[PDB]
Each structure stands twice: as structure tokens, then as C-alpha cells.
Amino acid sequence: QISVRGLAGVENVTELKKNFNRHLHFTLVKDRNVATPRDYYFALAHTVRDHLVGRWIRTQQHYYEKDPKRIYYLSLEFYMGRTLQNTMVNLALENACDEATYQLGLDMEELEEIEEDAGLGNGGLGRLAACFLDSMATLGLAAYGYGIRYEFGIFNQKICGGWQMEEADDWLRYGNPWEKARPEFTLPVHFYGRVEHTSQGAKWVDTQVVLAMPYDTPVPGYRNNVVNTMRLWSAKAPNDFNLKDFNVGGYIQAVLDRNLAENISRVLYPNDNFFEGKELRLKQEYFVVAATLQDIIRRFKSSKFGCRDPVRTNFDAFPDKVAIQLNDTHPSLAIPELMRVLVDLERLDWDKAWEVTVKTCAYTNHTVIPEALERWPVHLLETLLPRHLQIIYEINQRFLNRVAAAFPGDVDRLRRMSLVEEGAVKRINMAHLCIAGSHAVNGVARIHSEILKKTIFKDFYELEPHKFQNKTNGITPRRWLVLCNPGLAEIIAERIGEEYISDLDQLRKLLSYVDDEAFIRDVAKVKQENKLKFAAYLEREYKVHINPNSLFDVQVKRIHEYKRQLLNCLHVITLYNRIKKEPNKFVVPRTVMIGGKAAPGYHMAKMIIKLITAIGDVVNHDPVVGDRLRVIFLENYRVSLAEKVIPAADLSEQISTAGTEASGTGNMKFMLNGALTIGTMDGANVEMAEEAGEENFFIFGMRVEDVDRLDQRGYNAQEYYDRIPELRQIIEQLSSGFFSPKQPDLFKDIVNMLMHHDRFKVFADYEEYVKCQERVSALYKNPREWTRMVIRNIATSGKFSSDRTIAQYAREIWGVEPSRQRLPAPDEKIP
Amino acid sequence: QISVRGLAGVENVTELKKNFNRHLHFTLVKDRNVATPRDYYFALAHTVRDHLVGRWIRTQQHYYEKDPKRIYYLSLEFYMGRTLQNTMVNLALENACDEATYQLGLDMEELEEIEEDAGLGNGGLGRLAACFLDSMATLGLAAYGYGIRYEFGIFNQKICGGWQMEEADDWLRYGNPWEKARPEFTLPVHFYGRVEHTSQGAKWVDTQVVLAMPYDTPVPGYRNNVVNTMRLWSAKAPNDFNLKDFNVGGYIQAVLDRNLAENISRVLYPNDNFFEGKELRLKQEYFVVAATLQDIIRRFKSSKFGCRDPVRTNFDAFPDKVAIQLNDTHPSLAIPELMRVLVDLERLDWDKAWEVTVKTCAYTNHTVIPEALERWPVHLLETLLPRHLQIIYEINQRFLNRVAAAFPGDVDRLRRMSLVEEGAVKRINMAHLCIAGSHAVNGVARIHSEILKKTIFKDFYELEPHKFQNKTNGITPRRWLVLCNPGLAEIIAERIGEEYISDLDQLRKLLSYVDDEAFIRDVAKVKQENKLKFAAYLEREYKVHINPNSLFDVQVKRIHEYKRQLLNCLHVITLYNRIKKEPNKFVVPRTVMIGGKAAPGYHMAKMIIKLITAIGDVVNHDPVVGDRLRVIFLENYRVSLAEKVIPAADLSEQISTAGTEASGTGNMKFMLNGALTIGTMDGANVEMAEEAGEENFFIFGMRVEDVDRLDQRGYNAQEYYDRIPELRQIIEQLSSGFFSPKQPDLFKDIVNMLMHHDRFKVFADYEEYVKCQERVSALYKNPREWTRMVIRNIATSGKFSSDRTIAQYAREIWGVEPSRQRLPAPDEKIP
Numbered sequence A, B: 001q002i003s004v005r006g007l008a009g010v011e012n013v014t015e016l017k018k019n020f021n022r023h024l025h026f027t028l029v030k031d032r033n034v035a036t037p038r039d040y041y042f043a044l045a046h047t048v049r050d051h052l053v054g055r056w057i058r059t060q061q062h063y064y065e066k067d068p069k070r071i072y073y074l075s076l077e078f079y080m081g082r083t084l085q086n087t088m089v090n091l092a093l094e095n096a097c098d099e100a101t102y103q104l105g106l107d108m109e110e111l112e113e114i115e116e117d118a119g120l121g122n123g124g125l126g127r128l129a130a131c132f133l134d135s136m137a138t139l140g141l142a143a144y145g146y147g148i149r150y151e152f153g154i155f156n157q158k159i160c161g162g163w164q165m166e167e168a169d170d171w172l173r174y175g176n177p178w179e180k181a182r183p184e185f186t187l188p189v190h191f192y193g194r195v196e197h198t199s200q201g202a203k204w205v206d207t208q209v210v211l212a213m214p215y216d217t218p219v220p221g222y223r224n225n226v227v228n229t230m231r232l233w234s235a236k237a238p239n240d241f242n243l244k245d246f247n248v249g250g251y252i253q254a255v256l257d258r259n260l261a262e263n264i265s266r267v268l269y270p271n272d273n274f275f276e277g278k279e280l281r282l283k284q285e286y287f288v289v290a291a292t293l294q295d296i297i298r299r300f301k302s303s304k305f306g307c308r309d310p311v312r313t314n315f316d317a318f319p320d321k322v323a324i325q326l327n328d329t330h331p332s333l334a335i336p337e338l339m340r341v342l343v344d345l346e347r348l349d350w351d352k353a354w355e356v357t358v359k360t361c362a363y364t365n366h367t368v369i370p371e372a373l374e375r376w377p378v379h380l381l382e383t384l385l386p387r388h389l390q391i392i393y394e395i396n397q398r399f400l401n402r403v404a405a406a407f408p409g410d411v412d413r414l415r416r417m418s419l420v421e422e423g424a425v426k427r428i429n430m431a432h433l434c435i436a437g438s439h440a441v442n443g444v445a446r447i448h449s450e451i452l453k454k455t456i457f458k459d460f461y462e463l464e465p466h467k468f469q470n471k472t473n474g475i476t477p478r479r480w481l482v483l484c485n486p487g488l489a490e491i492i493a494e495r496i497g498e499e500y501i502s503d504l505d506q507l508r509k510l511l512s513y514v515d516d517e518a519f520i521r522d523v524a525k526v527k528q529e530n531k532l533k534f535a536a537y538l539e540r541e542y543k544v545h546i547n548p549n550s551l552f553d554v555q556v557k558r559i560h561e562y563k564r565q566l567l568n569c570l571h572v573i574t575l576y577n578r579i580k581k582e583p584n585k586f587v588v589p590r591t592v593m594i595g596g597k598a599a600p601g602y603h604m605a606k607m608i609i610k611l612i613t614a615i616g617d618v619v620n621h622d623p624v625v626g627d628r629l630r631v632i633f634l635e636n637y638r639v640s641l642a643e644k645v646i647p648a649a650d651l652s653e654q655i656s657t658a659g660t661e662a663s664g665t666g667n668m669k670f671m672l673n674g675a676l677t678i679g680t681m682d683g684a685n686v687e688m689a690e691e692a693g694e695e696n697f698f699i700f701g702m703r704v705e706d707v708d709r710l711d712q713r714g715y716n717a718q719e720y721y722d723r724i725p726e727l728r729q730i731i732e733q734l735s736s737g738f739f740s741p742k743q744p745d746l747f748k749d750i751v752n753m754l755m756h757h758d759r760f761k762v763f764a765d766y767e768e769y770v771k772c773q774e775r776v777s778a779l780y781k782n783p784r785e786w787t788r789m790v791i792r793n794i795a796t797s798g799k800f801s802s803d804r805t806i807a808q809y810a811r812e813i814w815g816v817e818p819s820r821q822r823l824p825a826p827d828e829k830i831p
């Protein structure tokens, strides 16, 4: 018994070894004597991909025969991570491949580490899209992920001298065994041009043509023979005009300029919760909307309609056949674009086309911070997409009339609700477009959904209350438990069975073992084993040593002023300062691991990375501290690293100023993997504590009320500085170079900011946070009672499955029903 | 009996059908109901490539075990054409695949047409390299083709309004089933930088790094189980400095600028026999030399030396293990580069390193016209490659001293021989570098080799006569007979057997059937069948009809003033004019097909294409002419088209001014495919007539003597215009717009040129050429005697095999022996 990673059966280990050898010779064109671990990794990736082309082809032909309502998940990000082990888990192949490669004399685990991550996402939003795709295929939905196939994903972070160095992520350098290019299905996307109003229609004329080429990646559900499709577009120059617009320039130059159109899919924008109004971003945005909508209408034009039905292309049933989800406002151009095709090209009247558009679209909002909001300058939309600016002015014109009629005489409302913002440069507010042209708008945790209805989209909720919904986020139990933490899934599965992997509410049944002494030791034992293995990985891939017997205090997520890595930093310096003061007083030892990426242009986030490494230089070399405290910055945090750190954490840091994190999902990953949370009543932390009970959680701080009371009052940090000696001491340590000796003024920007422009009021939660941290160390010191609380969190985390989330989107926004029904085998077949 | 395209055996047609179906499902991820002809083409290309990975792997391990002298053929061009049928011919797979796909219900021939050509060549030089690679693998040589993997090959030509329109050749748009990327083996190439002279060596410091990534394509020999390798390099940005040279620009821009380094392999230069001194061409040139030489020295450092031998890396045996052939001066930077590594990096003294360099390198010259010669400006070499300019000045310094010592006091010689040319801008003459640093220099036909020794490299021949050699070009009997013309190879094979495919001298034995009446009808019958099939292809892919019963008069090659498409044009207008004069007088009917590509910037060549289409507009629409004369411009001439036209020709036009075409190979292709040649005593036409006897050939014109007598005299075209009424009439037809009605002055440049600056003296051969053409029509009118002459040409064409050429390079330049010895099977094997 290795774990329940499937049967390592006799006819099938022999099958896998035969095919491994076919692909090393025939695919890789290598022989055993010059094959490296990477060639071995590829022979395995190809052998495993062979088991899902069967199911893929019959899942796709199936939706064609039966023709269900189809769900299009449009996102500019998909943060997939590595795909070999996930595919093995979902096909029940993991133990047979483990035995087979072991027989070939190889370590599967060594080979798995060779796979480069698909890092086509920034953080939270992109990873929600990967967890969503997994759950839509597990629930049997005829669902399609649609996005851009970026050839450079999020940069790989290097720390040089304590500073982040960004370098290009050439994830495709060696190939991608999982995608299937589909150049047969390329589609044109148009840019610039102008509009001729001619007799029976506006026409978009004189456009530049970029071609969008598909690449399909299979999305397997968990053990049900459904393999859905993630289609990702590549930009390609036409070979005509990008060459045959003639009369001198140069032939070589005309060919070399082809990579002007192909730059559109070259690199992801590295910004998490921050809007950059660059023209290339808008081009990326129109490009995935333009091409996706052609693929969508094509499938509807076949359906059972391009056969018969009423016979007239009656777009009336388009909403009963199509649901498109907008993942944030990044694909909001899908609303004027679907209006353009229907009015200009299919020739429907405005009001029929508008009824159809709003009934098929729906919008997920992901943040309330204002700098994250997309507000595109009109002179940009004007130049680039002139017909869509006209459709946005007419949507706007008609929406505000509906507002006028309902709130008569309320003239500030009208200017407030406008999709057009006057000012310095006029802008189009993409979030207002999405509520006007969607039938459902949702937030991503119950508090955030309430804050949208009460603050940011209040006027919109008073006008159309029925659109506003909530759908709390989730995580997939398959990568985020079964795959990163097989030890924990075994000891759970020993007691309650394996049906919980697709029914996570069943973890409630673990609550009757909260006093079972074998289970308490087992739960404690795997956390000890994970702590040992990450501690080893650390000296392997990156180190100068840690202590597995300390509390592993970890905060890993994007670096942001609202997620508050500086509040954690202030806490760490307190601990150091107190044991410099009382050296021979025992304290619970901690390894505090802080990791994440800062966007290239966010100078404060880049300075926060420099402060964490500077605290670590001092703390990790004090001889009086010894092993009692280490501070480690976790380099190049990404999906595959999160699969390693989150099993080995004891304490989860979820420290954002109440009202700023819309949900968070890092927090959920840590709850089913046996970590306890210290956190504010923010995002989904509220529903997590409500699920485990506030006594099984360490909440501190200001709630949203208190944040607004303080803002009515006026936040003044000098008051905190004046009343708290310990906090006072830290700041003057920063301000004199204790932490930056050669360069004493280095941290003047963090100090100036914290003292004078702290938007997320870090000092207001400092006392309650160090006092809360005093209570978790007290519980760590009582192992039996830490593990019984941990068992309260694991057992109560199944609400937070993305299968719960997807079944509610499916039921209350998409109008389709989940099915955990196994599709009729893979079995062979050629027709 | 289909033809002798191999056995369509029982266990093997079932084998091929099984594998076709495996790849359509598993590789293509398609099912029979949505698979197009292209998906079918790919299932076949993958099934056939599976039969040569076995042989490839054992051919490569073999040279490793036995370790022979290895031949590196360095060329900036490889004009490969399509590779499926060729591979099928060489593996004896053609009939089994024909039966197998027929059983699957498909037409192999329809699928073969779907393959896009690998057009990584311009014409003559690049196609010689593809014919050379075929013959080196058929003769069992441990040989490597080395070049640039261009992603845009030679442009696809469109005629719009009679004008050439150039468009990009995206030959990889759909994939290439034949290459195998080898990113594991990438190598750095350095650019710009500077030289520090430091204590014990010059060092090239501060360089930009481009990475060269290999892609290997298999080269199968004819039926012998040898599969050699064509390695082709791709340019790739490093992800460090092309990003981590820091302090503002932009992160997105730094990633988008990666395609500055990757532009180096983006597009072939479309110039045939013309030098453009562009910096990107030099970068292309240093890049294939830099990376190839690293791969070469690596293999020598293992050999049996990196095991033992004397034990010291004694580069003395480097010439006994390495031979590199330079295909024209385009890889001449291989001589200062191999000196740089040996002196600077391996630290040999100058004179030992120079002895080794000259003993391993050899240079093929391909043309005597001066504008084709590479003469790179010193300020270019200075900037880009500063260490190599220093090595070229020291090679030069020492070479001219050897010249001084041998020709004492001859000071004009010294300036004449110099690798450095003073003048307006100093330049480095790349051809003089190649003779100074090569042990053999050869030309490509016996006259051209003599003209090199007598005119262009006379000083160099007086100094070192032993270097100058001749190696007349050849064509491969496999694509150029067995593959384009299976009908002709069958009727030959019926009489004399199949050993001639690798022993083409055996075609002499056909001479005893010159009076066999069955053979005369058969030879005539396949030419009739080919004429019928190209005439059909014409209305299929491109037309408004031709007559298969006319003489197919075809001139297909690059458009150039020296290859003289205008002399053919003058001839065509004469024929038209004479039958406008005597309408009811019978003449032998002709379809004259002129095709080829003009380089983008060669305005006269582009105007010659416009004149041929304008003659065709008039001639093809005269009702008095009827079918007696049609003029057709053959669009987008390339390798796969040449495989179609050359079997269907009756008359081969090889009309270049004596002394300008160094060899020609189009002429050889036409001699083994049953076409008669009208031609001047130029290039290899001389050795062809000498092989078939001048009575079996239609030679006309000025010989080289006469060209030089006329140049001593002074060529004056007005004299020709004054004495020949028929030629006079044509010119004034051009000069008044008979051929360009709306735009009468359109052809003033061709007339002005012909009259005043004709470098290739088109009018001097006009009388003798129309008079020679009068005699071929007279023989066409006597079918039995045309076919008996045709049989004199086929039977005597085996000198012109590239296997004869390669066995003489091999013996008299490379020092290795051919072997037609079948390598021990494909048979399976895993070690």
C-alpha cells in the first residue's frame, strides 16, 4: 500500500512500460544510453497523455451529439501549474505509473519535478480559473476555458542582493506535451479601421487583420471520463498585407515586422490588482474576445439549428444554448462585440440583440480597490476599435434613460452611473458596462458581495437588485489535497473512504475522530513528515538550513500594501527585539517564511521584499537568537512551490486590512492541509471561522466598521507611535539603519509611508496582532490541543470546494445541472 | 505491377494501416469523421518517419563506435523541397504506402500534394546542397549538413497584373513532421564586444549572446539503412541580459525586444548571384559558423581521444578526423573562427593552428560575376566581430609575405592579392580568405574551373597551383528520375534492371536499344503521358488551357540578365511576327513556358517578368495564331513544381552568355528526363554535349573566345539592330507599346538597356539562336528521330549524377572512400 493513488495492476504496468519505451525511441528519438531525466519526463508525459485522447475525443463528440447548454469561461488568466501528476490523479493512473517507472528503474518524483509550470496567471484570479476548470469537468459540464496562449508567463523571480530580479519565463523552451495546436481553425481579428454608415448598416472598414490560432489543452475531471477543453489563442500575422501593402519599405523589413502582430500574445501583464492602461493590454483583451466569440457562434450555428429547429437563424435560443462567464472586466469587450456581430453582421434590431446579450453574459467582480478597476481612455478605444466605442455610447445612452425614468430628477445619479467618465481624459468604466450588459453580477465571498451592494455598485443595486449575487470561492480538493498531500488524504481515506474527493462535505465525518487518539497522532505525524520534506527541499534547491521542530509560520501570496506583509514584518522584528532583551527566556521557536512576487513597476512592493531579506540578514545571524527564530524569503513563489510549502505550514498568515481582500483562496488551501489561521475578519476568512467556529480560529483586528469609524475620525499613525514603545523602537531601528548598516537611509520610504500615507493602516492592528500571535504560540506548546483544533479546521473545510462553487454558478447563474455521472468509458473506437 | 516502387507486402501494408490509424487518433487527436486531407497527410508523414528513426539512431551510434573522418557540409542554403515521397523512395516504402492508403480509401498522390516545400534555398547553390546530402548518405559517408533553420524560406511569388507580388512563406504554419528540435544542445554565439590583450592572450570581452538551438532532420540514403543528419540552427534570446541588463527601459519592452536576437534566423535572403552587404546577413553568416564549429570540436574532443589516443588534446589529428566543406564564401568566417578557438581558447601557436585550419577547410566557388562576390566593409566587421578582423589582418599579413618572397619586387601583385581592398570604403574580400585558408578550391564545371585559374584567381593559381581543382556538379537520380518520373524509370528498369539508381553510368547500356522499336515507342509514350498530366495540372491549379501536342519549350530557373530570358523573349516575338506575316503557312506548334523568381529588389528582373506576361497577353489572344503558339509564365517556380514541369518538357532552354553560368543543374535534370537541349557552350552544357556528342545537342552562339574578341573590339548593339530587320521590328514593337497599349513607354528600360548597356550581349546570339531553333522544330516534325536523339541524351547522362561528384570530393578533397554497403538492418534494438 503506497497510498490510494489507484491500482498498480498487472496488464497495465506492462502496458505503461511498453509505451514509455515506444515514445522515448519514436517520439523523443533517443536511446536509453543518452536519455537524461528530461527525456524520461517526456516519455512519461506522452505515455499519460495517450490515456486521455480517447476520453477527450469521445467527450467532445458527445456534446456534439446530445448538444447541451455550453459554458464559456472567458479569462485573461489561467494559472494551471504543472499537469502530469494532476492528470495521473484524475485518471487513477498514479500508482501504476509509480510502479512502471520504478520497474524501468526511475523515480517518478524526480521526473515530476522536471515539468515547467504553465504560469499563465498572476495569482488569485488566474488560479481560481484553473480550479474552476477542474470542477466544471468533474461535474460534467459542457464547459470551455478560453484565454491567450502567452509565450512568456509571469516572470521567474531571482533575489540578487536581497532585491527582486525579474527574468523571462520561457515555459515553452522545451515543448509542451499537453497542448494540441489547431492551425486549421485560425480566425481573423480586426483592429483600427473606421466605420462607414451605409444605407442598411454601419460597416467596420479599413481594419488591420491579426490571425488568432487555437491551441487546445485537455481538462480531465476526477475519475469520470470527461475531458474538457481549454482553448488558448496565439497571434499570427497574415502573410498578405503583412507583406502586400506595397510601394517600398523593404521585403526583409516587411517579414521582420510580422512580429508586431505576433507580439499580442507574447507576454502576460505581471500586475496583480492594479490597472495599467497600455494599448497592448487592450489588444490582448479584444483579441481573446473577438476570436472566442467566433468559435462560440459557429457551434451555435451548427447545434441542432444548422440541421433544423425553427429554420431561420433565430438567435432567440442563443441564451438557452450559450452562457459566457466574464472573469473580471478583462473580457468585458465581449458585450459590445456580441452586440456588433448580432446587429451589424446578423442584422438583428437593437432591442432583440440587447435582450439576447444580457441573457447570455454574467460578470464576476474580484476587488473593490480603485486602482485595480479598468477605466480605458476614450481616445484609445476611438483609434483602435471605433465601432465598439459607438456601441458603448448607445448602450450608455439607453441605460441612463432607464435610470432617468426610474429615479426622476436625480441628476447626480446619472453622472455617477454613467459608463462614460468625464474629467481630465474621458474614460469608459468597464465595470459599469459589465453590470449593464450582464444578467448576474457576483462577488467572491459573502462580505465582499455585501460591500459591492452597499458601497461600490449601490446605485446599480437600487436600480436592478435581482442581478447581484454571491458565490464564495473554492479550491479543488484534487491538486490541493490529494496531489500535494497524499499522506493526509490516506489517513483520512483510512477512516472515512475516498468519496470525499468529489464530495468534500463528507469531511464533517472526521469530527467524530477529534478525540480518537490514533487519528490525532496520525494527523500530527504527516504534518511532521511534510515539515521534514520541505525542510530538506530547502537545503537541496536553495539553502543554508532550517529547524523542522519550529512553528512554520508562512505567508505566501502576491506582495501588496493591502495584503500587509509589513504588519508581519513588524511582528517579526518584535520577537527578535524581545529575545535580544531577555535572551535566556524560552520562547516557542518559529521559522517565518514570507514569499511572493512583486509586480516589476511596484516600487513599494519591491522595497518590502528588500526589508524581509534585511530582517533575515540580521535575525538569521544573531548568535543570541540561535535556532529560536529564522526569517526566510521564499523565492519565486508559484503554483508548484505552493504545493510544497502549504502541506508543511503550521500557521497561515491572512492579515489584510478588513474590507480589502475580496475572498482569498490561499487561506482555503491552508485550511484543508492542517494549518491554523491567524487572520482578520476579511474575505472568506469570515466564512471559514463561521464554518470551524471562531474558537478554532485566531481572529484579530479591526472589523470593517472599525476601519470606517477610524476613517470618519481620521487615521493618524503618530498616535500609535506615541503610545506603543515596542512599535516606536522598531521604527527608529528602521530609520537609523540597524537593519541597513552601509545604507542607513535605505528604508525611508517605508517609514515615511507608514507614518504619513498608510492606506491600509498597519499600526492600528499591531497591538491586537502581536497579542493574537502570543496566543498561537501558547497553543503550539500543547501539541494535542493544537492537533485537535487542526482537526476542527480540516473537518469543516468542505464548503470551500470549487465543486460547491461551480454547482452554484451552474444552478443560479448558468441554468445547468451538475452530474457526477461517469461518461461511458474511454473504450477504443474508430468510427 | 504499378511501377518498381517496392513490394506492397502483406505483413507490411497491415503494419502501415495500423500505424496510420494510431497517429490520426493519438498524434493528430482527430477521428475519421472530422479528418481532412491534411490530417491524412500528417498520419502518413508520421507513419513513414517511424520507419527511419530506427535506422537514424543506429547510423548515428555507429559513427560513434567506429569513429570515421566526418564531413561537415556548411551552407547557408539547403533547398530540400517536400520530403515524404523522397523518404518513401529511399526506404523502398512507396508501393506498400500506395496500397495501404488505397485500402484506407485515400489517394496517396492527393496527400503528397499537401506537403509544403522546405524552400530554404534560392536556386542552384541551395539545391546542389540538397542533392549533395542525398549522395553523401547513399555513399555511406559520415556526413553532416549544417545550416540556418529559417522560418521564412524564399517568398511565394504571385503574379498580379503581370507583376510579381512577393508574399511570406510560412512553411512551418502547420508543423514540420520531419524535424526533431534539440533544445538540450543549445550553444551561445557572441556578438560585438571588444578585445582585451592580456598577458597570455587576447580575450573577446563584453559580447552580446545569442543562443543557437539545433533542429535535426534525417537524410536517408537510397536503400542502404544509412540515415544522416541535417542540423539547422534557430536563434533564441538568453533570458538573463535579454532582460537583466538593468535600470529602466520597461519589463514588457525587454521581453518584446527578445525578437531582436531571434530575427537572426527569421528569413532567407532572396538573392541569387547578387551580394547585399546587410548587417543581418553577416549575423546569419557568423551564427551558423560559430554554433557549427562548437558541435564539431565537441565530437572531436570525444572521438577516441576523449577516452585516450596520445592524451594531450593534440589538435594535430583534427584534420584526420574533420573535413569541413565551404559552400561558397557564405561560411568563410569558419577560417578566422577556427583560428580564434584554437589560438585564443585552446592556446596553440599561430603556425600550428594555421596548418590545422588549412588542412581541414576547402572552398567551392560558384560564380565569376563580380556583383555576386562577398566583399564585406571593414567598419562592419570592426563593430560586430572585432577579434575576427584582427585574425583576418594577421592571416593577410603573413600571406602577402609569402607572396612577396615568391614574387619579389612584384608590388601590383601584392595589392591585387590582398584579402583587404582599399578604396572608397575598405572591404575584406571573402573569396581571397577562402583560398588562403583552404587546401583545395574547386569550381563546378570544367570550363568554370579553367576560367578561375585563367582569369579571376590567376595570381592565386600561380602562387599555389596544387589547390585548384574541378568537380563538375551533378543531380540525384532519386528525386530527379525515380521520384518525378517513375514512368521513365520503369521502362528503363524493364530493360536494364534497377542497379542504375545508384550506379547511373549503367544508363550507357540503353544505347543498344536506340534502334529497338518497342523502346522508342515506350520512351515516346511516357513523355506523352507526362505532357498530358502537366497539361491537366495546369487547368486544375492554375488555368485557361494548353495543347499537349505542341513542343513544350521550357526555360525554368532564376530570372537574371545573364541567364537570358530576354533572348528567349526576342525569339518568341519572332515566331509570332512571322505567323502574323504568313498566317496560312504551317509551323510546328509550341507552348513556351518561362518560369522563375526575380529577387525583390532586382528591378530589371521584375521588368522581364512583366514583358513575358505582356507577350503572353498579345500572343495568347491572337485568333490568327490559334493553338500554334502559346506563351505561359510558370508561377512560383520551386522544387516541387520543377518535379512536374521537367518530365513534361521536350526542349530545355540553357541560353546564358558563354562564360557566365558556372555549371547549371537544371540542364542535367532535363537531360535524364527525355528533353533535348538548345544551348550555348557554357557551364556544364559543354560536358553534357561532349558526353552525348555535339550532333545530339543543339549548340549555338558565341563561345567564350568570341565573347572576349567582341569585348576587345567593343560590343555595339546598334550594328545588330541595323543589320537584322526582324530584330529591328521587335524593338520598335516594344518602343511603341504594341505589347503595352495603355502604357506605351512601360518597356523603355529593357529597350534602353539592350541598346546601350547590355552586359550579356543578347543581340550577338540572336541570329544563331533563331536559326538553331529553326532546326529543332524540323527534328520535332520527325518523331522517331527526335526520340532516338532523346535516347542518346538519357543514355549518356550518368556522368551527371551527384554520386559521381560526391565520390570525387570524397576521394580528392576529403580523403575518405565511398561505400555502397548496406548498414546492418534497422532492426529494433534497445540497449
Ligand SMILES: *Cc1c(COP(=O)(O)O)cnc(C)c1O
Pocket: A122, A123, A124, A127, A556, A557, A558, A637, A638, A639, A642, A663, A664, A665, A666, A667, A669
Ligand atoms: C492560490 C494562489 C494564490 C492566491 O493566494 P491568496 O492568499 O488568495 O492571495 C496566489 N498565488 C499562488 C501560487 C496560489 O497558488
Ligand SMILES: *Cc1c(COP(=O)(O)O)cnc(C)c1O
Pocket: B122, B123, B124, B127, B556, B557, B558, B637, B638, B639, B642, B663, B664, B665, B666, B667, B669
Ligand atoms: C535545379 C533547380 C535550380 C537550378 O537551375 P539552373 O538552371 O541551374 O539555374 C533552380 N531552381 C530550382 C527549383 C531547381 O530545382
Ligand SMILES: OC[C@H]1O[C@H](O)[C@H](O)[C@@H](O)[C@@H]1O
Pocket: A123, A124, A125, A128, A273, A366, A367, A444, A473, A661, A662, A663, A664, A665, A683
Ligand atoms: O477571486 C480570486 C481572487 O481574485 C483576486 O486575486 C482577489 O484579490 C482575491 O481576494 C480573490 O480570492
Ligand SMILES: OC[C@H]1O[C@H](O)[C@H](O)[C@@H](O)[C@@H]1O
Pocket: B123, B124, B125, B128, B273, B366, B367, B444, B473, B661, B662, B663, B664, B665, B683
Ligand atoms: O553550383 C550550383 C549552382 O550555383 C550557382 O547557382 C551557379 O549560378 C550555377 O551555375 C551552379 O550550377
